[model samples]
Target chain A: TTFKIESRIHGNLNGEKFELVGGGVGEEGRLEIEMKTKDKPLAFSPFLLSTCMFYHFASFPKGTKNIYLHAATNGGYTNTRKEIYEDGGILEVNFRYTYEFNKIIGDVECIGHGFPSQSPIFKDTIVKSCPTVDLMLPMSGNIIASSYARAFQLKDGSFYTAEVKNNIDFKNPIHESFSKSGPMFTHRRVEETHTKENLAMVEYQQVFNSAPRD
Target chain B: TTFKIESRIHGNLNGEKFELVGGGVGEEGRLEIEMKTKDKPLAFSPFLLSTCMFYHFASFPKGTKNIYLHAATNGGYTNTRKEIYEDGGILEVNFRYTYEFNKIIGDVECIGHGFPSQSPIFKDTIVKSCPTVDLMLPMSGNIIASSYARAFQLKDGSFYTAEVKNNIDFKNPIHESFSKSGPMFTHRRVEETHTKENLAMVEYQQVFNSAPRD
Candidate 1:
């Protein structure tokens, strides 16, 4: 019962107040962060990354297997330039953004830079990382098909959901395994076509409830 | 044993064929991809862009993960608009590149964005989303430590030996779980001292081996 990632290395999100300072984070956690940079000494880019969804996952449950972070310093100062700024940059600039996860270990180098120059797709998978190993969120669209089921939070988790067609716009995409019947989610639409390919598709249907229990 | 992602919706790495041409990848794997653009109204961007190394990994296994592609389709095409072309203008543009990973799903507009506006680290994860989990790499000059223990592939696998340290030079990561002595792999060495943190710390210690099991 390990495998962690609840998050708050120290605390404060809306009001901006983080702590944990340095090193020693459990389950492959390496915490350290300090802040204050919305505007004062410079602007445009001080440091502020992102993440926060609620009821989620993608992997990690068995005591864990990976994740190592180093969001090193921000309270006293540190963020080695990358955006090059100066608008309110000097008065406020404290930062922190570090994360870690598990499982995906191995030995690589299949063939420099060739076809499938690498292999070991999830220790030996065929399909099982979707819809919601465990997660529950937003709506208003009508579709939001996902493909990144890491940590199945759903209790008895099995996998089935099939049938939901339309292939031409985004082209096509519907790898079945966790059946129940459509619309668990789908909101893809980043169109781009020169002759073919560049997708974000979703047709939409509904029926989901299976994936939880620790 | 049904996790999936061995490779091939219609494969071919060097020669180019990449089918699955429609859309239907699992896990963090979104779908939609079809390749070709040797010439036409354009030739500079054909859905080609990749980054490869001898070998790598940072996530995947249970479902298959790790993709460091480098389609290298920026030659001769000169992409004439974003900058008006000249640095290498020949003109041939047939582009297609739309990827989706982690959590930033879309609709965006959560308030121009400000402060810890997010953080869940992929929803209470512990391990579930794999078989092409994630890894997009390249660039060398020295050390950097990694800590991702995906598959155990190696019954007779060769080696260029990747997976030694965390992703660095951007420092602020450390997720502990499997500790034997440090050297499952590491070569980290990229330092920054702006004032608070921008790391690439390996502290130095090389003694690698023992992590090959299939």
Candidate 2:
């Protein structure tokens, strides 16, 4: 119900500059969390931050099969009459990804993450795709990898391994569960079915800074 | 991180009814209550449900701006792409809420909890209201007596003692704070200021059928 801490992350997650202010009044003698994000679109409101977070993924929005990855924590329900999410969900990530689609017969172009068009990441996309390939980029922030490509492919192909933890591949077991205070790295859409394709693993981490960092 | 409880409301607090499901696996290893209200609108979602709640009113919620209380539990953040709330938010309230504008009009009968009038919570409209002939109907779950109301008018002449114990009208000392498993009976968008409003006078009680009742 109350979390007081200031571990603000003023950096980029996924792509843009992400601002996360976690924790506020140590004790809830009164109302200190000032938020009015209902009805407003893409409005920015700080979480009732928990120096202790009850992390949970709000949703893995699925639209274009274009594939991407997402992590969201919500503030709770709304009257929709906008608007719990007093949930300390960690959002976004730092990752290594490879974008690909087959059907291109001409030249392929790289998309997303503000990666420069001429960068190796982009060049790699063009090299592998057949312009004749048919596909569209899924709106952003939704998914990752294909049946033929994944973490192993991501690690082996990307010029570098962006993050070190959460490395699972097609060769790994189909199911796994663990906990940590870090990023979830992968290519498959963990939202649909964590245990569906490639490496399916679900991790449970403690929300606040507790005695046991479960 | 987890709360698994059914939707149960006992005795009562508001006028219509009470829909609260407090405590699932509390005792977070101690008593930190958890709740989840699915379809009940305006039903309180307080971490602190008073064993002796002075619940004043509940808008049974009519059609447009009728009456309803909402509590939402969210997934987390989006990929920019991954998130945007589904909006389970229950907005403003309808009372004998008079419809006023330029000229002075007469009393507008109360409507909600389920009004058939025409309207949606609206996209840009915030159901504004005027302060008038005072009246309060604290819904019941657990509460008090009312011959004419309870306490005396606290602040000004217009705003009278809506409820007793929660009286913050000056005559009352600094304030107080306590906890237990329960709900908070309030107005002013507790969803946004539950933490902000009640340093007025704090009280807590045990939830459900726990060790301590009050």
Candidate 3:
């Protein structure tokens, strides 16, 4: 289905100076915009776009997709109070994202998805909970990084890495306990999840297989 | 006519537990109460009593015309709002004093005072703007001793110190020539006057001294 998804990116886009770019297999597949950061590229997925289900491609590619992704920090997902257009281009998808930071996790971005252009197959529209991506930035304050780690897949082309550190503990006690427990503990753990309050854990990651700096 | 000048201390008097000592005056003609900081004595001046006057001791020995003076801080001061017997003690005084760091020049106590009591010399009412004395105290997170240079003595024997780094520059070009200046700089240069606003400056001093620790 070669369908077009439309949404608005509200607020002062000029003030933030964010770049928008994406393309994928079929028109109904996933779309991602890479953000510049000290770590990996922070991705933004539009409606009906799932990295697991879609074979992705990009119409225009610039810098490495390993910059940074900052999520929407303000306003609810379903609320569309402001909208901005660039060069009068008809936006196929519009939404707002925010970035938050504190002592422990440096910065986190939460993407707030708006109403989709077309209804999904199972329901009138797809209303999935927004996901918060933690971009572990390097520690520049009193905190020291105790350890760092990452993993990559050359087979499925998927990369994942979890870095542990002796950083400042910014997580609430309850959330921290739940996060340590398991993925299956859903009741109170899911209730405590602030969709917009994701923390970004920052750390330096090597982009290419290059020689380590002395 | 051998007259005797007698001084009696009142308020929360447990006769066996407390004793008042008198220190002979040097050339200053002021009475001193030497009490340890930990003792926290509730000191009162006979001069604060309506019956005590300058010449009541005319028949006594030379220098016997004692003008009793009492200064204390964080100690009990007589409150006019709640009347206590020693009834119709028209010269009743109530003052709350704050002491911080700074040198005691001459007889200055460096003690900041607030809230006065009733006296007949001023129509049996509290006098506003009395002179304050300067005294030095050890510095702690709760207590501060500001530089003497920035301190101001109010008419009611209360002193306050400014916490600002830069002194007011009245000779600035904007204040010197107001017409050509912007709105911020067009005001006239006024003499240093202590008002309620100076109290805020003192509070800022306390905060400035403590904030760096955290």
Candidate 4:
């Protein structure tokens, strides 16, 4: 089984697209992302891609100990920044308002009082120098949250910069061992910069459920 | 095999103390918190208590599936509001500064650009109704994130209210099956109010490591 998120952003040619794909069975599975975009005239700022999956410990490969996170770029750009998060709490607000006469207006005090929400926390995480990032963690509830922060040359030569919040709950047959409630998979992407100029933006496509096998 | 956090708050009599305790092992493990403080003269607003533990799925009891979250009170209060969070991203800041006048002061742009961080996400979550919340989720990454929002009688019969960000990474022998990087346990508490009055502010004590199991 595999999970993928594909996004298409407006482009000068026929538009651009990128895919974050991952899947595999047992401990031998893999996680990687591929994208097609411009070289220079930077599209956006450095951003982050993070994910968490809960699995049965028996599914991990033997000798899979002290699993840490690692990431490497294809070297189409210069410099890469990597980091990890394994703890903390978040305060989120989903609000709507109207603007009139240069004044903002809205109602309702106490937001986020009652609603569905989730966040990420990864332990023993790290990043190295990659075409596809390599395996470092192999266990249930292992989180691989990383970022691709590099600079590439534009067609003419210029630098630039550029993100989500998502959650997936697994139950019953899908997650054979997932007897508990709450999401089995969670993901998010943080943009590097918010700019008016657009090269190709990223969108979130829900994880796919492959056709059943005979 | 037990973890506890003890805190003390300034009080007119002596000092106020509250303890968040949890422990046990295997499927018999339990998570609960206890505190001692005021009845009326509301100290602060409503708040939340959240915790996540990565355990061996097999450690769960038989027929443990679709685990949801629940919380209830001792009826010493009025209107109990409970909620949970298991997904999303968090942008945190740990900054220091100096103030001479009324203006704010600081340095070093591009904060949180790099540094460790983590968030939470849950699945199939729900809250029913309690003195000590009951069983729901019994597997790895089962997050019991809840809040206690109620009104109580004050000395003068007045009413009012009030909230962490924490991450615990289990490694090696301690976490028998934890062969991964990233925190194994994450917790947080959100307060309801932030008033000047103080009943007995909560404090966090690191999880206790019982003396070398003699």
Candidate 5:
């Protein structure tokens, strides 16, 4: 596919730009941008994000993976996230979490919520202090419920389901001394007023364990 | 994925027509047209043609069989011709024999093309002739070539550094007579033409397939 889209960027910073990029299976894809910057490093400017959906066909797979997303800032801040849902719970994967500031960063974290036929609830919050300082924090965990069945005078079988949720608070105090106290100050205050709710399905499954014969 | 495309009838006939089609993997994909002269039929119209390209995943094994394609028309007129090619004439297959018109009336005639290769050419074309007195025919096809091979071959092969072009002239007497004698004719033609001038490396593969084997 060969085509071009034209749009204008209007803000404190202004400029005209043209980009030419094209490739397919086995071709070297490239992006060339020619634009003049109005200000250096920390300038607020409008940018054009253009890409071809044809190239995405060579990247995404069918069925198993749901969504692929990436975001970055001009100050070298980047974030990548992917979510995969299984029968019991959803696995949330995050990459480049602290890597913008710290190079050679690996997979930041994997949070699994609600297992074995339960839906997990997760939430995150970001608070901006003044107009420049910002903070983001998240917390997640799970709960498991199980029942045992006795057959022929023996504890023969058991079934279990897990549920999980998390509450994250991002509050930055005004004073410099208070801002340095970290996330615990925000969490303690929010936990006192916030109420937790159970969100998941009730499911049953057999559980077994193997041990060395006595 | 399933989609419906509504097209306006150009040329002499002028109206909006709807075609409901369903196609994906593991099903006999179909195209049905709804027009004023006929109700919903299990075939494509003479004026309409469809083309597509299929690509397997990177992990698909080298040798796979039954790479089949079947097309049929279920109107009063019979299909005229079909052709298939693989690897730019490293192997060539064609079928040009005409079928009787009466037996195919209102019955679907299954015509298809298939071939086997470790790494097959990933392009095909489907063209249909219009049933008009002035020979106003419509043609459409798709070209899916390996970007890696085409780019490298062009740089190294030396005969043509850029692009190549070809033309076809059907001014023969037999073709002229057949174009004039037809009742609502629908002709399907698939042409595979390679204009690569340097053929010293490709000549051996084009010949020497003799003595049929069981």
Candidate 6:
């Protein structure tokens, strides 16, 4: 076990920059991050163009393992006060891993593009994270790849957004799906069992800029 | 008024690129965006490095007017289900404007770091938004620059990130406040009343990358 992952970006809004790397071995272990901005057209603040990223595996392989959250989006439900437009979904879910974990963490809400007239509230939540490792995980993993428009009030506005394109080696953790933009939804964090040593991963990635350019 | 604004980045990972520009005039006017990534180190995906940015002012000043959110940061409250650690504040709020609006939209939850062992739930919530313009505004503005470590979980983890530094023409919409990273909290959208013909703005600026590199 020679892995000790740690990623950051709890805040910063202009001259953006990011980098997070993790080792591999267990099911092709993985953890990768990259970000940039020293200059070049960018602005959009709720979190300054897009910011809030934290990941820490800090070297694992002691006990408890069984992670899966394949996710491919068009509809979502893990019950966080369930309300996928009146609890009715079926627009997409290909590779399907849905949700099943031994320990992935907590927090994962998505709504990338308008469609929440009410109910799903948490003070209008928009959270990004970074704890420098050791928030003492019971689970602190959040995701809301937003950009999931369900078509004009949930029936005709079309736009689902999802991408990873290719080059994910967490045992073929591939991604690619879009209806309008880039990432309305896309996931890969599987592990049925395949790690012997060198397994540490942490990824708080939130890079923005999309248009069929992967 | 001859101003029309639009910005987008619903989703995409790898090969990032962003640009959102809104005209000027009125309160000196504002709405400037910049994002870049075609190549040069970038990765982190909750939304792929950082994605989900939307702003569309289309054009305002036909009837209603009143906006203010001059925030600086250290403590936050607009009551989206209050819980700033047992309702006890006072860490910072210098260039304050707090929260006020006639139209700034909705959805803004900030938690840049780790904190919330409990009580502040929404299925974990992590939302970013975009809607081609026309969500019909009742409020669609969200913010949660999480990086507020209240010291040892509530008394000594110190770090509050904030920045904009300068170049905000919304009538001195200056920003600069940090406890650890950048944008722990920083705001400027003040307009007690100032616009009469060049008043159209939209900003969803979320540019990540920091460190005294303004």
Please, what are the lDDT tens digits per residue for candidate 2 over residues B28-132? 112122333334543332322222111112221112121110111111110000101113221111111111221111111111232112212222122111111
What digit string (tens of lDDT, one per residue) describes model 4 on residues A126-176? Answer: 131011111111113322212111211122222111111211111111222
What docking grade does candidate 2 earn? Answer: incorrect
Off by over 4 Å in 4: A1-7, A10-33, A39-214, B2-33, B39-214
lDDT of each: 0.18, 0.19, 0.19, 0.20, 0.18, 0.22
- Specify the highest-lDDT model's number: 6
- Cα lDDT tens digits, model 5, A1-214, are 1112111212211232222222112111111222222233212111111110011011111221111111111212223222222234443423232223312222223333433322212211111100000011111121111111100100111111111122221122122221111111000000011111111111111111111011
Q: What is the TM-score ranking, best to worst?
A: 4, 6, 5, 1, 2, 3
Model 3, residue A179: what's the lDDT? Answer: 18
For the candidates in turn, chain A alone yields TM-scores of 0.17, 0.17, 0.16, 0.22, 0.18, 0.20
Whole-model lDDT, model 5: 0.18
True lDDT of residue A202, candidate 2: 25
Better of 2 and 3 by TM-score: 2
DockQ of each: 0.02, 0.01, 0.00, 0.02, 0.01, 0.01
lDDT of 1 by residue, B100-171 (tens): 332111110001111121211112111111111111111122222222211111122211111111232211
> For residues B1-214, what per-residue lDDT tens digits would candidate 5 score against the true structure?
2223222211110122323222222111222222222233322222222211011101111222111111212111112222222222221111121223211112122222232222122211212211100011111121111100010011111111011111111212112222211111111121122211110100000000111111
Model 5 chain A scores worst on lDDT over the 10 consecutive residues at A184-193
- Candidate 5 Cα errors over 4 Å, as ranges: A1-74, A97-103, A117-214, B1-61, B67-214
lDDT of 1 by residue, A1-214 (tens): 1233222223232234433211111222111122222222211111111111011112222332211111111111111111111111111222223333532111111111111212111112112212211111211222122221111111132221211111111111212232212112211111111101111111111122211111
User: In model 4, what lDDT does residue B145 have?
Assistant: 19
* Candidate 2: stretches off by over 4 Å: A1-214, B1-174, B177-214
**Could you tell me how far off, in angstroms, the CA of residue A162 lies in candidate 6 after the best superposition?**
17
CA lDDT, candidate 2, residue B39: 45
Q: Which ten residues in a row have the lowest lDDT in candidate 2 chain A?
A: A77-86
In candidate 3, stretches whose alpha carbon ends up further than 4 angstroms from where it belongs are A1-12, A15-105, A109-214, B1-214
Superior by TM-score: candidate 2 or candidate 5: 5
lDDT of 6 at A174: 24
